[PDB]
Amino acid sequence: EEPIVNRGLAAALLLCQNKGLLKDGYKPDVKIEYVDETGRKLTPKEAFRQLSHRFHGKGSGKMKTERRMKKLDEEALLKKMLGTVALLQE
């Protein structure tokens, strides 16, 4: 119930917290991962698939490419964002 206050960053952080949006001698600052060239962090199953594709030197097929494109488009559309029609039809 906390609105976005103007010229204030604590209100947006409170709304995000309420909505659930939140030897030389040294310590190693190492955190490695396997994120695809598109920037998406590949799943461990997907990472293993990519590694096996690289080892075998063979990529995805035509149908696999189509399925991947459809899944990526659907995921992007979902990440981008019928009540009015149900209210008008009632």
Partner: protein, 56 residues
């Protein structure tokens, strides 16, 4: 059997709703209805069956 039919009807109504409009979470008031809900629509696991103890 009636409870299983109800869960199947709920899953079919979710499937009737578009995947882009599929509820990412499915809060069920009935305690024992979560397992049949997951079994009926295991092919659509994008919905998480979260518990809501305080029944509205």
């Amino acid at each position: 059997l009636a409870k299983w039919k109800t869960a199947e009807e709920v899953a079919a109504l979710i499937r009737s709703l578009p995947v882009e409009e599929q509820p990412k979470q499915i809060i069920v008031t009935r305690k024992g209805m979560l397992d049949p809900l997951e079994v009926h629509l295991l092919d659509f696991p994008n919905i998480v069956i979260k518990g809501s103890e305080l029944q509205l």
